Amino acid sequence: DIQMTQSPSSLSASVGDRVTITCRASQSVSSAVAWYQQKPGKAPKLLIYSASSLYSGVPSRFSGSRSGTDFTLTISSLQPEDFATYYCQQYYGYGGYPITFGQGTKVEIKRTVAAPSVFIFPPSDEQLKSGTASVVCLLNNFYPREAKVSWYVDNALQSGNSQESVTEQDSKDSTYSLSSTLTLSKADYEKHKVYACEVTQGTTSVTKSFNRGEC
Amino acid sequence: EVQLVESGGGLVQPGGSLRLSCAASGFTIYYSSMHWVRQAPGKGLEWVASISSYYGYTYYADSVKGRFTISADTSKNTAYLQMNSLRAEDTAVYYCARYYAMDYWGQGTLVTVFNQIKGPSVFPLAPSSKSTSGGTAALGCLVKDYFPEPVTVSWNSGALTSGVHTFPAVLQSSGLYSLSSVVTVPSSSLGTQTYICNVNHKPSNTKVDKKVEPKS
Amino acid sequence: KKCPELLQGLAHFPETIAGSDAPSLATVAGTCVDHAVVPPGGEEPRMHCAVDGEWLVPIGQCLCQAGYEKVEDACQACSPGFFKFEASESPCLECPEHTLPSPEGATSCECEEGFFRAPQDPASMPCTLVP
Ligand SMILES: [Cl-]
Ligand SMILES: [Cl-]
Ligand SMILES: [Cl-]
Ligand SMILES: [Cl-]
Ligand SMILES: [Cl-]
Ligand SMILES: [Cl-]
Ligand SMILES: [Cl-]
Ligand SMILES: [Cl-]
Ligand SMILES: [Cl-]
Ligand SMILES: [Cl-]
Ligand SMILES: [Cl-]
Ligand SMILES: [Cl-]
Ligand SMILES: [Cl-]
Ligand SMILES: [Cl-]
Ligand SMILES: [Cl-]
Ligand SMILES: [Cl-]
Ligand SMILES: [Cl-]
Ligand code: NA
């Protein structure tokens, strides 16, 4: 397979910015390269084909170019509708060889750094009756995406018993949110008092906690 | 207008079989090449197979050779993907698309390879002083121990969307999925306003509505 | 009792009077739109204007030439990556296996380096490995 090495895997930009996404083929693919846009919940959309031909109905702010094995998609003035994921593709030989795609580039909205609002939820008594306890930590509306979550049980740092999930950028304020779940047995949960979620972002850590034997 | 309408996806056990259809309108499928491209949840695009009834060829990704068969019926202007000996790694949204530079795409059809079906338990994430910041309180629903994907969540049957965050599922060490959905609401409203998460799990035909009440 | 200007079968037809006793008058010859032609063994388009003022279905037609395809009532050059090597009713075809992307309006796609097309084979033939 000819590989398409797409870079960067993501970038943050503002409306009106010039944006460039580059894809390097692992050998010559002639001009047999296309570029696609995809938004969540939707099928991909063809932008550019034959390396530089603009597909009908795609605005002229999109352009494609080739230099040897390097292919670039340029957006001359990023529009609100252009925040999306972009993929290159090669089809050299029109069937002679495996079709391959780049791994994609996510184009996100740049905004200022934002500290999360941090909340913690003890396990529900409904769940405790079932023999498992889940403690949930919520990091609400922060930016950039990068954050470290650490769990503590009676000041004992936990490891390997939590999992976390992140939302895509919020359409209103362009932030992210993140949830982390600590899983213990009921028996372990009722053996301890203080449960704490610590969120670290840059120069700031925020620890949210609760006393199992308080209200 | 050109349209590609897919059907035939769904739930299948490992080793089982499915047949996808791609019905074309607005052009003559015989004169085109058609392609199947799949997308695993959270991943990129992967070519699966190609066919040209005009040139009389079929081509397959190595990962599906010997298991999938691409075909067409030009008299029905439809393309097909017969998928046998399905594997967990085959779970994806499958698209059909026209031409190597894929200008028209079907709407996608989800193929889910499952070894078990289990509906979720839904636990409340109650608002409290550990989930309050001034005029704002966070609350939510923890959706635990379901399989397979997906689950969707709404609040108050769609009447509440502002401030909702529904997170991607995680795959627990148990083999089952879990996600959470949260919403931020005015903390003054907590005594008076009712907040219900609506959790839908098509694969088990289960919906759970859970009133989230303040803790006491 | 007047048939209007029409585009039909990639041919332009003039305004004609209806109810003419002469087949030279009620039936008119169409002229091919740009990049359309009448094939070597084809009928030149002619259309009859009826007494009530409505055109009948024409006899004969023009066809888009090599490198062009019919889009609505016009002939449009094949897109890059496509070709059409003869005047025919056919759309442009996507380049065959082991060819290189074609420019706009192409009559064939060039073979990939190391591949060839035998002269007896049409341009739709995919290229084969040079031994
Ligand atoms: Cl890549
Ligand atoms: Cl998606
Ligand atoms: Cl080029
Ligand atoms: Cl949009
Ligand atoms: Cl090669
Ligand atoms: Cl904010
Ligand atoms: Cl970020
Ligand atoms: Cl992160
Ligand atoms: Cl991928
Ligand atoms: Cl096969
Ligand atoms: Cl069938
Ligand atoms: Cl697998
Ligand atoms: Cl439940
Ligand atoms: Cl209430
Ligand atoms: Cl209820
Ligand atoms: Cl006239
Ligand atoms: Cl042809
Ligand atoms: Na066309």
Contacts of A183 in chain B (CB under 8 A): 172
Query: Which of A50, A89, A92 is best to mutate for the C interface (most C CBs within 10 A)?
Result: A50
Method: X-ray
Q: Are strands A148-153 and A194-201 parallel, antiparallel or unpaired?
A: antiparallel
Other CB atoms within a 10 A radius of the CB of residue C106 amount to: 23
Report domain extents, chain C: 2-64
Contact B97, B37 (CB under 8 A): yes
Deposited resolution, Å: 1.9
For B97, B98, B184, C52, C95, the CA distances from A50, given in Å and listed in that order, are 17, 15, 48, 51, 12
Q: In terms of CA atoms, which chain A residue is nearest residue B133?
A: A117
Inspect the interface and report whether the beta carbons of B55 and C126 lie closer than 8 Å. yes
Fold of the domain built from segment(s) A4-109:
Immunoglobulin-like (2.60.40)
Assigned token pair, B91:
């779970």
Burial letters for B142-154: b for 16+ Cβ neighbours within 10 Å, e otherwise? bbbbbbbbbbebb
CA-based torsion, C92, A25, A89, A106: positive or negative: negative
Nearest to B100 among A36, A91, A181 (CB): A91
Indicate the burial class of B130 (C-beta count within 10 angstroms; 0-12, 13-18, 19 or more): buried
| Separation of alpha carbons B47 and A4, rounded Å | 13
A214: CA distance to ligand 4 center in Å?
A: 47
For B83, B95, B102, the CA distances from B111, given in Å and listed in that order, are 10, 11, 21
Breaks (C-N over 2.5 A) in chain A follow: none
| Separation of alpha carbons B123 and A50, rounded Å | 53
Residue A49 CA from chain centroid, whole number: 27
Ligand 2 ion local residues (Cβ < 5 A): A 40
Inspect the interface and report whether the beta carbons of B167 and A165 lie closer than 8 Å. yes
Of the candidate CATH numbers 2.40.50.140, 2.60.40.10, 2.40.30.10, 3.30.980.10, the domain formed by A117-211 belongs to 2.60.40.10
Inspect the interface and report whether the beta carbons of A49 and C94 lie closer than 8 Å. no
CA angle centred on B183, ends A40 and A13, rounded to 5°: 40
| Separation of alpha carbons C73 and A63, rounded Å | 30
Other CB atoms within a 10 A radius of the CB of residue A159 amount to: 8
B43: CA distance to ligand 2 center in Å?
A: 9
Catalogue all structural domains in chain B, each as residue range(s) with its CATH number: 3-113 (2.60.40.10), 121-211 (2.60.40.10)
Which one, of B85, B97, B93, lies nearest residue B43 by Cα?
B93
A63: CA distance to ligand 3 center in Å?
A: 11
C103 touches chain B (CB under 8 A): no
Assigned token pair, B24:
């074309």
C19 touches chain B (CB under 8 A): no
Contacts of B33 in chain C (CB under 8 A): 94
Report domain extents, chain A: 4-109, 117-211
Which one, of B196, B18, B212, lies nearest residue B109 by Cα?
B18
Query: Which of A2, A91, A94 is best to mutate for the C interface (most C CBs within 10 A)?
Result: A94
Torsion-angle region of A66 (φ positive above 0: left; ψ -120 to 50: alpha; else: beta): beta
Tell me phi and psi for residue C59, to 5 degrees.
-105, 130
Assigned token pair, C77:
């050059």
Name the CATH superfamily, with its identifier, for domain C2-64.
ephrin a2 ectodomain (2.60.40.1770)
Same fold, A4-109 and A117-211: yes
* Residue A45 neighbours by CB under 8 Å, 6+ apart: A36, A37, A38, B105
Inspect the interface and report whether the beta carbons of B46 and A101 lie closer than 8 Å. yes
Ligand 10 ion local residues (Cβ < 5 A): B 65
B42: CA distance to ligand 2 center in Å?
A: 7
| Separation of alpha carbons B100 and C80, rounded Å | 12
| Separation of alpha carbons B45 and A6, rounded Å | 13
Residue B47 CA from chain centroid, whole number: 19
Q: Is A137 helix (H, G, I), strand (E, B) or coil?
A: strand
Ligand nearest to the CA of A42: 2
3-state helix/strand/coil string of C67-100: CEEEECCEEEECCCCEECCCCCCCCCEECCCCEC
Tell me phi and psi for residue B34, to 5 degrees.
-125, 150
Residue type, C18: A
Tell me phi and psi for residue A177, to 5 degrees.
-130, 160
Contact B49, B100 (CB under 8 A): no
Residue B153 CA from chain centroid, whole number: 13
Q: In terms of CA atoms, which chain B residue is nearest residue C127?
A: B55
Contacts of A51 in chain C (CB under 8 A): 101
A71 touches chain C (CB under 8 A): no
**Radius of gyration (C-alpha) of chain A in whole angstroms:** 23
B39: CA distance to ligand 2 center in Å?
A: 8
Residue C41 CA from chain centroid, whole number: 14
CA-based torsion, B61, A8, A81, B158: positive or negative: positive
| Separation of alpha carbons B181 and A138, rounded Å | 10
